[PDB]
Amino acid sequence: SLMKPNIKRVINATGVVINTNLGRAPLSKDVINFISEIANGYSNLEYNLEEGKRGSRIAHIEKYLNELTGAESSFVVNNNAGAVFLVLNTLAEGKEVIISRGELVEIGGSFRIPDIMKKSGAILREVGYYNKTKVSRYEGAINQNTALLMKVHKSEEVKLEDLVKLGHKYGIPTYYDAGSGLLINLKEFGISVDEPNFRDCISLGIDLVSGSGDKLLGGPQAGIIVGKKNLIEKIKKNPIARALRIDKLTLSGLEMTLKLYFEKRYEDIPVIRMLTQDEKALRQKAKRLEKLLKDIPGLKISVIKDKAKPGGGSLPELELPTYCVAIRHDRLSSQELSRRLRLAEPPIVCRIREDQLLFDMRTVFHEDLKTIKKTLQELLSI
Amino acid sequence: MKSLMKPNIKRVINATGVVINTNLGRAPLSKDVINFISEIANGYSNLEYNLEEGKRGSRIAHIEKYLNELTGAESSFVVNNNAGAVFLVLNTLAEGKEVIISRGELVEIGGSFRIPDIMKKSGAILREVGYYNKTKVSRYEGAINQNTALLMKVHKSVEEVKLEDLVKLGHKYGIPTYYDAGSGLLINLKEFGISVDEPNFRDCISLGIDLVSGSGDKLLGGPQAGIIVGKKNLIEKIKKNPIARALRIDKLTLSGLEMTLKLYFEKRYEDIPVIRMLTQDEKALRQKAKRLEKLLKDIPGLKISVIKDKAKPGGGSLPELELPTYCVAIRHDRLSSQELSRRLRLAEPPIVCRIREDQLLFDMRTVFHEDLKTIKKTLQELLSI
């Protein structure tokens, strides 16, 4: 009678908070309600109300970014892959970009990004070796035909402070594709990582810094670029920008996400909330799930501690403890049990370790514990 | 009620009569579409995940089949917007090679001066043919050489190369044809009482155009998107172009697009705000006008009329669309239209009318009957004692 849509809500028990397969950052009700208000009718998306004339949509969020990063100017495109392409194509078409050989490998966890840079029409001057880039071999690559000095967050090297110096010395713009999209200091939450945020790279004097909006920033998909007004303007005039132009849903979502950062409402940004769940809340979740599952014949269940990587393939540096519930059935293999769980309504996506199914509490929401249980007992039944 | 500073992006009452109003956000979405978008967004999903195989999969698998069924094409792809599609098509099929296009079809594409500059930046060599207002099949044909890669045509924005001619050349010389229709029209408008020479996807493909593209938020009435359909061979090339990854559509627009396409499948055309608005009865529009004319009768210095206008609701991308409508014309004696207009734009919520010879027009085609109160309540405050 009625067909159900292909795209569906999914219970994520993999423990990966920034999970690309499963949509990256979830958005809070508050962010979504705003997106709904704007979408449900007409708005001032590309309209300057004071002057009653067409205006650019980026004006709606650029103040937000500049403040939060201390940059001169900001701009936003479809995604950060696009930002990279746009920056290269703008500043370095027919010219040379200097980048470390390793930083070019699997950019962002993607094998498509380095090729995008190749399509940008920039000539890539790869210096050094896969895990060795000496500042000297970098500085020596510099030509009259050198137009950009690049660094990419990874997935001895040249350091950001060095990039800045080479840039000042030879009069070449510096671009750091940060990736993570991080706005805040993760130390302010109890978490320890060498993950540079936007504000910091600009404090150091990086000319251009870019990142995704749907990783550590915890907003919708977006390519955020910030830095020198001179470079920004060039980028906004690049007609390619128009193909990369951000839509109304993501832009509204981005404005409300950024308002949250201003009002210090970090609890209303799911990515942060989940990343700052204390180890105690997590054990409690597990213990409760174990509880829920003990009336299921055939199931062996234990609660285990685990050092996991909730950041995903773009942020494999982020390491946090978590609690998982481990299950094993006497008649169904983990793989088949997995396959069945993915077919449920809603689907449940757990991870597999050494012939066990792990439910990682870092990403499982409390209201869905009941659902895991009901689903498990229907599946292991006849 | 709960905001320290109010957000810069805001809802606006649209009284211009332009349904496809780019300044004002183009196509609004139904609650049904927004609710789906909401569910998908408020948690995790299978956005890039193949639940069967338990592995990564591409998000376009979620909507390719709708597009294919609805248009008859062999295959389909969706990118950020239709500006992107054009860039992607050209860069993919004709990097460092020639694309033949009608001189005038290259001018103010889709109401935009940036699209043609984008095409130049695609890596393609644009071989412009004929002259601004005249393109002769013979000139087009003779621009063809070994280095020619793509035969193109673009939606208008007298003698021209017609679609059927484009197809024939393409077949004759063995060069793929691409039609940037722009409008995104999925269904014939004649089925809705609307008389327009506006080509839809299915029709363009059945003629044999290799590739057809358009926006998702004009006539289609979904969120922003660049929709591309046609021969599998060409689509697959387009999908392998790493540039595609930079143009990749996000979760909100993809979800919204799936639900939009589902509405078409169920022929629930009433749930597509663009369609709904363009099919409003002439009689239904006069009712709103008269209700508002009556709602404003008690306003000091307000001269209130109701006129009957021939308007263009498609916007600068679709000027060939003309539809009757009803407006309410107002004129204060103290305040001038410009100044009154300015004040309406600063109200909460803002109101955006159009002006005609020092008179304000409130076109009912785009005003929702639920808003008429707000318009009154606002005009009285701006014009009180």
CB-CB under 8 Å, B39 with A5: no
- Partners of residue A239 in chain B, C-beta under 8 Å: 114, 117-118, 120-121
Of B11, B84, B262, the CB nearest to A5: B262
> Residue B367 carries which side chain, given as an amino acid letter?
V
Report residue B1 as tokens.
């009620």
Helix (H, G, I), strand (E, B) or coil at B380: helix
Q: Is the dihedral of CA B352, B353, B358, B359 positive or negative?
A: negative
A266-270's contacts with Cβ under 8 Å and 24+ in sequence apart are A266/A184, A266/A189, A268/A28, A268/A30, A268/A31, A269/A28, A269/A218, A269/A219, A270/A25, A270/A26, A270/A27, A270/A28, A270/A218
Please state whether beta strands A9-13 and B44-45 pair in parallel, antiparallel, or not at all (unpaired): antiparallel
- Taking alpha carbons only, the member of A207, A188, A184, A205 closest to residue A196 is A184
Q: Read off the DSSP letter of residue A122.
A: B
CB-CB under 8 Å, A39 with B87: no
> Residue A80 carries which side chain, given as an amino acid letter?
N
- Taking alpha carbons only, the member of A247, A256, A221, A301 closest to residue B45 is A221
Q: Read off the DSSP letter of residue A97.
A: E
- Taking alpha carbons only, the member of A234, A201, A226, A368 closest to residue A288 is A368
Angle between the N-to-C axes of helices A248-262 and A62-69, in degrees from 0 to 180, rounded to the nearest 10? 40
As a whole number of angstroms, the distance between CA A198 and CA B294 comes to: 56
How many CA atoms, within 13 angstroms, populate the side-chain half-sphere of residue B300?
Answer: 8
Q: Say if residues A167 and A142 touch (Cβ distance below 8 Å).
A: no
Among left, alpha and beta (phi > 0; psi -120 to 50; other), residue B282 is alpha
Method in brief: X-ray
Report residue B284 as tokens.
């239904």
Q: Say if residues A227 and A208 touch (Cβ distance below 8 Å).
A: yes
Report residue A378 as tokens.
């229907």
Q: Read off the DSSP letter of residue A222.
A: -
A5 close to B (CB below 8 A): yes
> What's the angle, vertex CA A213, arms to CA A210 and CA A217, rounded to 5?
100
Q: Say if residues B45 and A22 touch (Cβ distance below 8 Å).
A: yes
- Taking alpha carbons only, the member of B152, B155, B215, B156 closest to residue B186 is B215
As a whole number of angstroms, the distance between CA B225 and CA B58 comes to: 16
Best residue in A7, A49, A64, A364 to probe B by mutation, most B CBs within 10 Å? A7
Give B96-150 as a DSSP string. Answer: TSEEEEEGGGGSSBTTBSHHHHHHHTTT-EEEEESBTTB--HHHHHHT--TTEEE
Q: What are the two backbone dihedrals, phi and then psi, of residue B62, each rounded to the nearest 5 degrees?
A: -65, -20
B224 close to A (CB below 8 A): yes
Of B43, B246, B341, the CB nearest to A9: B43
Q: Say if residues A20 and B250 touch (Cβ distance below 8 Å).
A: no
Report residue A36 as tokens.
């709904």
Number of H helices, E strands in chain B: 14, 15
Q: Say if residues B321 and B310 touch (Cβ distance below 8 Å).
A: no
Give B194-207 as a DSSP string. Answer: -------HHHHHHT
CA B231 vs. chain centroid, Å, equals 24
Helix (H, G, I), strand (E, B) or coil at A370: helix
Q: What is the resolution of this structure in A?
A: 2.4
Report chain B's terminal Cα–Cα distance, integer Å.
Answer: 28
Q: Say if residues A362 and A281 touch (Cβ distance below 8 Å).
A: no
With CA atoms as reference, the chain B residue closest to A352 would be: B54
Q: Determine if the peptide bond prior to A310 is cis (ω within 30°).
A: no
Q: What are the two backbone dihedrals, phi and then psi, of residue B233, each rounded to the nearest 5 degrees?
A: -55, -40
CB-CB under 8 Å, B248 with A81: yes
Q: Say if residues B119 and B282 touch (Cβ distance below 8 Å).
A: no
Helix (H, G, I), strand (E, B) or coil at A304: strand
Helix (H, G, I), strand (E, B) or coil at A162: helix
As a whole number of angstroms, the distance between CA B46 and CA A5 comes to: 11
Q: Which B residues in the span 306-335 are in contact with A, Cβ-Cβ below 8 Å?
A: none
Domains of chain B: 2-23+280-385 (3.90.1150.180), 24-279 (3.40.640.10)
As a whole number of angstroms, the distance between CA B33 and CA B271 comes to: 8
* b/e map B107-137, b = 16+ CB within 10 Å: eebbebebbbbbbebbbbbbbbbbeeeebeb
Give A4-28 as a DSSP string. Answer: PPSS-EEEEES--SS-TTTTSS---
As a whole number of angstroms, the distance between CA A303 and CA B257 comes to: 41
Q: In chain A, where do the E strands start and end? A: 9-13, 47-48, 53-54, 73-77, 96-100, 123-127, 146-152, 174-179, 208-212, 223-227, 299-308, 320-329, 348-353, 356-360
Residue A382, Cβ neighbours under 10 Å: how many? 2
**For the purposes of burial, counting CB atoms within 10 Å of the CB of A332, is it exposed (0-12), middle (13-18) or buried (19 or more)?**
middle
Q: Is the dihedral of CA B217, B222, B225, B229 positive or negative?
A: negative
CB-CB under 8 Å, A3 with B250: no
Q: Say if residues A65 and A215 touch (Cβ distance below 8 Å).
A: no
* Overall size of chain A counted in residues: 382
CB-CB under 8 Å, A22 with B45: yes
How many CA atoms, within 13 angstroms, populate the side-chain half-sphere of residue B285?
Answer: 26
Q: Is the dihedral of CA A144, A145, A150, A155 positive or negative?
A: negative
Q: What share of chain A is helix, strand, coil (3-state, %, to 5)?
A: 40, 20, 40
Q: Say if residues A173 and A206 touch (Cβ distance below 8 Å).
A: no
B54 close to A (CB below 8 A): yes
Please state whether beta strands A356-360 and B13-15 pair in parallel, antiparallel, or not at all (unpaired): unpaired
Q: Say if residues A39 and B29 touch (Cβ distance below 8 Å).
A: yes
- Partners of residue B51 in chain A, C-beta under 8 Å: 10, 342-343, 347
CB-CB under 8 Å, A244 with B84: yes
Report residue A163 as tokens.
């990039």
Residue B303, Cβ neighbours under 10 Å: how many? 11
**For the purposes of burial, counting CB atoms within 10 Å of the CB of B73, is it exposed (0-12), middle (13-18) or buried (19 or more)?**
buried
Number of H helices, E strands in chain A: 14, 14
